[PDB]
From a paper:
The β-[name] (EC 3.2.1.26) from the ascomycetous yeast [name] (Ffase) is a robust glycoside hydrolase (GH) that releases fructose units from sucrose and inulin (hydrolytic activity) but also produced 6-kestose, 1-kestose, neokestose (all trisaccharides) and blastose (disaccharide) by transfructosylation of sucrose (transferase activity). Ffase is a butterfly-shaped homodimer of 160 KDa included in the GH family 32 (GH32). Each subunit of 535 amino acids presents a bimodular arrangement with a N-terminal five fold β-propeller catalytic domain and a C-terminal β-sandwich supplementary domain linked by a short residue segment. As with other β-fructofuranosides of the same family, Ffase performs its enzymatic action through a pair of key negatively-charged amino acids in its active site, namely, Asp-50 acting as a nucleophile and Glu-230 as an acid/base catalyst.
To this aim, the inactivated mutant Ffase-D50A was expressed in Saccharomyces cerevisiae, purified, and crystallized as previously referred. Thereby, the enzyme was directly incubated with purified fructosyl-mannitol or fructosyl-erythritol to obtain the corresponding complex, and was submitted to crystallization experiments. The formation of Ffase-D50A/fructosyl-erythritol complex was clearly detected. The fructo-conjugate is spanning subsites − 1 and + 1 in the expected product binding mode. On the one hand, the fructose bound at subsite − 1 is fixed by many direct polar interactions of all its hydroxyl groups and the ring oxygen to Asn-49, Gln-68, Trp-76, Ser-111, Arg-178, and Asp-179 amino acid side-chains. A water molecule is occupying a position close to the missing nucleophile carboxylate acting as a link between O1 of fructose and the Ala-50 NH main-chain. This binding mode is highly conserved within the GH32 enzymatic family and determines its specificity for fructo-based substrates. On the other hand, the erythritol moiety is accommodated by polar interactions between the secondary hydroxyl group next to the fructosyl linkage and the catalytic Glu-230 and to Asn-254 side-chains. Furthermore, as it is described in more detail below, the terminal primary hydroxyl is linked to Gln-147 through a well-ordered water molecule that participates in a network connecting residues in the surroundings of the catalytic site.
Numbering used by the authors:
A (entry chain A), B (entry chain B): 24 to 535
C-alpha cells in the first residue's frame, strides 16, 4: 500500500542514521557484533507493506562495519500468519553451545540466537530462533514458546550471559503490571522467574527493558544499569526511555537510590537497546521517533530512522553546585570513515550582535555537526539578551527559508531547542512539542567563569544534542517544507558587548 | 521601581485567582483557617518594590471568607536587614500553648505560630514568630533560630501537629542534598532530626516539602502523601511539584512504592502548600507560574497569581486497561459566591464539522468554565480528524482574535493544550512550552464506548484543566496581545460524521 510516486529522500532522508529503503520501522532489535565477520548487526520492527505499523510484522536487518554506513538485507524473521508479528527482542552469541544448536562448523563468535516476543491474537510469548549463516536467516526452535505466562502483555526480552551466576539472564516486560521480570536459564530454552522489578515513572506500560554493566570513567569498576521504555505517559508526552543505577547478582537488581532519570530528554528516543558482544564498553541506539506522531510525519516511501550509535559510560557530575551524582553519559559513535566536505573552525571568539558566526559552504549534503566550548563572561545585559542561538537554515525555496534554533540562556543555565516550522502540517502535530529545554551545571570553571560544551549533529530530519561532553542527550526529529533541508549554520546573539566567549567552534559539512 | 503608569489589569488580571495589587509574588506561605473568625489566610513571598524577586523579601498577607474573594492586608513579616528575606514557611495553631507564647486572653483557635526560613548572606535557618491579633502582626521568638545546621541550602518548613505521636512535625528541604528532613518537637522551639527522605525526580534541588494525611474516596481509610517541589530540572522544564503515597508514624515516611508522579502536569503549578486547620479533607494551592519565565510575563504592576484552592483525595484509577493505582485526585474549590452571568447547555450532541458549539454571550468578564462529558464512537476517520478542539477566543481587536486551544485525540487517548500566541514576545519565551499533553484511560465505558470528562476554568491569564473528575490536573498561564482577553468559546471537529458524542456540555460566563 506504499505510494512509490512520492519520494521525499532528496530533502529529508538521513545520510548516516539507518532508514529502511521502504515501509515502516520502529524498535531496534537483535543488536550484536560479529567478531569473526567484523560486522555490526541492526534488526528492527519492520512493516514492508505500509509507512505505518501493521501485521504481519517482521525483523528487518542491516549491517555496518563502522555504525554509520548501513547495508539493508533481506527480512531475517517473519511470523507464521498475517495476523501475527515478530515483536522486539535481542540476540546473544552462544559461544559454548549451551543451546545445542551449533556444531564445530559454526565459529563460536557466530553462534547466533534471537530471543523475541511472538505476538498472536490474545497471546504474547518469548520464543527463540538460531542462525547458521551469520545472522541473515533464522530457524525457529521447534519447542517454542520458551516462556508462556498466558498473557497478551508480556514482551521485549533482552538476554545476556551472566558469568558470576553462570547462566543466561532475560529481562522482559510484564507491560501492564509495571514489572520488569528477570528470568534465568542454563540453555536459552528452560527459564525460571528469579525476580520482579518496579520503579521510576510508570506511565501507561513498561516496554523494552535492558540490564547491562556500564563502565565508570577512569575506573575498572562498573555499575549495573537497568533501562526501561514507557509509552504512552512520558512526562514529555508519548514515549521515553529511563534508567536505574545499581547492582545485580544474577537474580535481583537493587538500585543504589530510588530516583527517576531519563536516558534522553528529547521527544524522539525510544526502545533503546545495547549491542551484544561489545569488547570495550557499552554501545546502543534507539528508535528516533515518538509514538504520538511517528506514523504521520511527512516522509515517503519510508518512516523512521534509528538514532546514531552511542557510547555509554558513568561519570560523577554536579547536578547542583553542592552535589555530584553518578550519571549516565552518552557520546555519539562518529568514525573517521565519515567525509568532511567543508569546515569552519574558530577559537577565542567574543560573540556580539556585530560578530555573528556564519558558514559559507559551496553546497549542502544536509548533514552537519557543530562542536562548541563556551564561557559565560561577567556582563549584566537586559533579560531579553541573556542568550545566544545556533540557527540551522534551509536553502531559500519558494521565497522562504525554514530554520530550527538551538540556544543557551546564561540566566537559566539551560539549553533549548525550537523545532517549530510554520506552514508544515501533518496529523497529530498538536503532540509535536516544539520547545524543549535542558538545565545543566557548568562543565567546568575558568577562574569564576562558567564553562559549558555542546556537540550537535543534524542529518536531514533529525538533530541529536550532547550537552557537557554527553552529560545530557536530547534527540528530536524536524520537518522542513517540501524540498528544504539544512544548508547553513549561524551562531548569533543580540548583546552589544560579549556575554559569551566561544573558546572553540568547529562546524563541519559531512558526507558518507 | 514599579511603573504604576502602565496597568494591564483590565485584560490580564485574574478575577478569582489571588494577585497582589502591586509588586512580585512567588510561593504561598502560612496557609491556615481561623475557626473563630471563619477566615482563610494566605501569606506569600512578596517583593513590594519590583515585579521581580528581590530582597528585602516579606510575607505578604490576604484573607478570604470563601477562597475566591481576597482582601489584601499590610505585610505580616519582614526581615531585620535589606539583604535578608523571610523565605517560605507555614503556620500552625498551638491550641494547647505548647510554645508558651499564649495566655488565657488568646482564643485557642487563634494561637498562631509562623515557622519560616530566615535567609541572610551565606545562612538559611528555621525561625518562629507568634501573632496575638489573629495573624496580622507577628513577634519573632527572642531565641531564633530554632534550627541551624550551618547551611545556606536549608529551607521551606511545613509544620503540623501529629496526634498519633503527640508532637509537632516539621518537613523541611536540605535543598541541594536532595533530602526532605523530618524533625519532631514538643514546643516548636527544640527540634530533633528523626529521618531523611530522598526519592523521585531530583532535578537541581528539593524545595517546599509537605506531608499530610489524605482521605481515600468512598472509605474511612487514608494515606500519608509527601509533597515535594523541584526547580530547576523539571522534566517539563523549570519548576514542578511531585508526590509520594505511603505511611507515617511520626518519625519516618515509608512510601508504598518507588514510583515518581507529578501533582500537576502543566508548566505553572509550583511550591504547593496545604491549609492548616481544615476540618474536612485536605485543601491547598500553589504559585501559578514557572521560574523559567515568571519574572518576564507581560503583567504590570504585579506579577504572579496563585492557583485556585483545590480539594485533595486519593482514588483507585486505571493507569492502563489492566491495572489500578491509588492516585492523587484534585478538584477546584468554586463556591456559590461565584455568580453565573450566562450559560450554554447542550446534551447528547453528535459533534461534526457542520455542528460546532459556539457561545454567543452579550459581553465578557474574561472568566469562563466548561464542563464536558463525552463518548468516543466507533467511527473510522482519517488520522488528521481523530480529535475535537475547545477554542478560547479573545474579542476581535484591531482586526485580530487571539486564541488558545484545548483538545482531545481519540487515537492517542490524550488531551492537549496549545497556548501558542504568536506576536506576544517576552524575555525567556524560548522556555514557555506551548504544547502540553495528558494521557488518560477512560473515566468509564458505556458498553464498548470510552467515556471521558473535562472541567476547565479560564480566568483572564490562567487556565486550569481537570481531566476525568480530577484524575489529572494541568495549570498554565497564557498571554494574549495588549487589550485582548477571553470572550467566546467554540467546540469544533473536522469529522464529517460523529466520532465524539458530547453527553453533557455546560459553558458558563462567571463573575465575582
Ligand atoms: C567507546 O568508548 C570507549 C572508551 O570509554 C572505548 O574503549 C576503548 O577502546 C579501545 C579500542 O578502540 C581500547 O584500546 C585497546 O585496549 C587494549 C587493553 O588496554 C590494548 O591492549 C589494545 O592495544 C587497544 O588499544 C581502550 O582500552 C578502550 N578504553 C576503555 C576504557 O575501555 C571504545 O573504543 C568506544 N567504542 C567506540 C565504538 O567508539
Ligand atoms: C473537600 O472534599 C471533602 C469530600 O471529599 C468534603 O468533606 C465533606 O464536608 C462536609 C461538610 O462540608 C462534611 O459534612 C462531610 O462529612 C465531608 N465528607 C468527607 C468524606 O469527609 C469537604 O467539604 C470539601 N471541602 C471543600 C471546601 O470543598
Ligand atoms: O503494541 C505494543 C504497544 O503499542 C507499544 O507502545 C509499542 O510496542 C513496542 C515498543 O514501542 O513495539 C514492538 C511492536 O512493534 C513491541 O515489541 C514493543 O513493546
Ligand atoms: O532560593 C531560591 C531558589 O533557587 C528556588 O528555586 C526558589 O525558592 C523558593 C521556592 O520557589 O522561593 C522562596 C524564596 O522566595 C524559597 O523559600 C523557596 O524554596
Ligand atoms: C507484506 O510484506 C511481505 C514481505 O515482503 C510480503 O511477502 C507480503 O505479501 C505482504 N503482505 C501483505 C498483507 O501485503
Ligand atoms: C553441522 O551443522 C551443519 C550446518 O547446518 C550441518 O550441515 C552438518 O550436517 C552438521 N554436522 C554434523 C556432524 O552434524
Ligand atoms: C513476580 O510477578 C509475577 C507476575 O505478576 C507474579 O506471579 C510472581 O508472584 C512475582 N514473583 C516474585 C518473585 O515476586
Ligand atoms: C568535540 O570537540 C571536543 C573538544 O575538542 C573533542 O575532543 C570531541 O571529540 C569533539 N566531539 C565530536 C563528536 O567530534
Ligand atoms: C521595600 O518595600 C518596603 C515595604 O513597602 C519599604 O519599607 C522599603 O522602602 C522598600 N525598600 C527598598 C530597598 O526599596
Ligand atoms: C496576656 O498577654 C497580653 C499581652 O500580650 C496582655 O494584654 C494580657 O493582660 C495577658 N492576659 C493574661 C490573662 O495574663
Ligand atoms: C540526615 O541527613 C543529614 C544531612 O545530610 C545527616 O547529617 C544525618 O546524619 C541524616 N540523618 C539520618 C537519621 O539519616
Ligand atoms: C461538572 O459536571 C458534573 C456533572 O457531570 C458536576 O457534578 C460537577 O460539579 C461539575 N463540576 C464543576 C466544577 O462545576
Ligand atoms: Zn507559530
Amino acid at each position: 500500500s506504499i505510494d512509490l510516486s512520492v519520494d521525499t529522500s532528496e530533502y529529508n532522508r538521513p545520510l548516516i542514521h539507518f532508514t529502511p529503503e521502504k515501509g515502516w520501522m520502529n524498535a531496534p532489535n537483535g543488536l550484536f557484533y560479529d567478531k569473526t565477520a567484523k560486522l555490526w548487526h541492526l534488526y528492527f520492527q519492520y512493516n514492508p507493506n505500509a509507512t505505518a505499523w501493521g501485521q504481519p510484522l517482521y525483523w528487518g536487518h542491516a549491517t555496518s562495519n563502522d555504525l554509520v554506513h548501513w547495508d539493508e538485507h533481506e527480512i531475517a524473521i517473519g511470523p507464521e500468519h498475517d495476523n501475527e508479528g515478530i515483536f522486539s527482542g535481542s540476540i546473544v552469541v552462544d559461544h559454548n553451545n549451551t543451546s545445542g544448536f551449533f556444531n564445530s562448523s559454526i565459529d563460536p563468535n557466530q553462534r547466533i540466537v534471537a530471543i523475541y516476543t511472538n505476538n498472536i491474537p490474545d497471546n504474547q510469548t518469548q520464543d527463540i530462533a538460531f542462525s547458521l549463516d551469520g545472522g541473515y536467516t533464522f530457524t525457529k526452535y521447534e519447542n517454542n514458546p520458551v516462556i508462556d505466562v498466558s498473557s497478551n502483555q508480556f514482551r521485549d526480552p533482552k538476554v545476556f550471559w551472566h558469568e558470576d551466576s553462570n547462566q543466561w539472564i532475560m529481562v522482559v516486560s510484564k507491560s501492564q503490571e509495571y514489572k520488569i521480570q528477570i528470568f534465568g536459564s542454563a540453555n536459552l530454552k528452560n527459564w525460571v522467574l528469579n525476580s520482579n522489578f518496579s520503579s521510576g515513572y510508570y506511565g501507561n506500560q513498561y516496554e523494552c527493558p535492558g540490564l547491562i554493566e556500564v563502565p565508570i570513567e577512569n575506573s575498572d569498576k562498573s555499575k549495573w544499569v537497568m533501562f526501561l521504555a514507557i509509552n504512552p505517559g512520558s512526562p514529555l508526552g508519548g514515549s521515553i526511555n529511563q534508567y536505574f543505577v545499581g547492582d545485580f547478582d544474577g537474580f535481583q537488581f537493587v538500585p543504589d537510590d530510588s530516583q527517576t532519570r531519563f536516558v534522553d530528554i528529547g521527544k524522539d528516543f525510544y526502545a533503546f537497546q545495547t549491542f551484544s558482544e561489545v569488547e570495550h564498553g557499552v554501545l546502543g541506539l534507539a528508535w528516533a521517533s515518538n509514538w504520538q506522531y511517528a506514523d504521520q510525519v511527512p516522509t515517503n516511501p519510508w518512516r523512521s530512522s534509528t538514532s546514531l550509535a552511542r557510547n555509554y559510560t558513568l561519570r560523577y557530575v554536579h547536578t547542583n553546585a553542592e552535589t555530584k551524582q553518578l550519571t549516565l553519559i552518552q557520546n555519539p559513535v562518529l568514525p573517521d570513515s565519515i567525509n568532511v566536505v567543508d569546515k569552519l573552525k574558530k577559537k577565542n571568539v567574543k560573540l556580539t550582535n556585530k560578530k555573528p558566526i556564519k558558514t559559507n559552504f559551496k553546497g549542502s549534503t544536509g548533514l552537519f555537526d557543530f562542536n562548541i566550548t563556551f564561557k559565560v563572561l561577567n556582563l549584566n545585559v537586559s533579560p531579553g539578551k541573556t542568550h545566544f542561538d545556533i540557527l540551522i537554515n534551509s536553502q531559500e525555496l519558494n521565497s522562504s527559508v525554514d530554520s530550527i534554533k538551538i540556544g543557551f540562556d546564561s540566566s537559566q543555565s539551560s539549553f533549548y531547542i525550537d523545532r517549530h516550522i510554520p506552514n508544515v502540517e501533518f496529523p497529530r502535530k498538536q503532540f509535536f512539542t516544539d520547545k524543549l529545554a535542558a538545565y545543566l551545571e557548568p562543565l567546568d570553571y575558568d577562574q569564576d567563569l562558567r564553562v559549558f560544551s555542546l556537540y550537535g549533529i543534524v542529518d536531514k530530519n533529525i538533530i541529536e544534542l550532547y550537552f557537557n561532553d554527553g552529560t545530557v542527550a536530547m534527540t528530536n526529529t524536524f520537518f522542513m517544507g517540501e524540498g528544504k533541508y539544512p544548508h547553513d549554520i549561524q551562531i548569533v546573539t543580540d548583546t552589544e558587548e560579549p556575554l559569551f566567549e566561544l573558546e572553540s567552534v568547529i562546524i563541519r559539512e559531512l558526507n558518507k
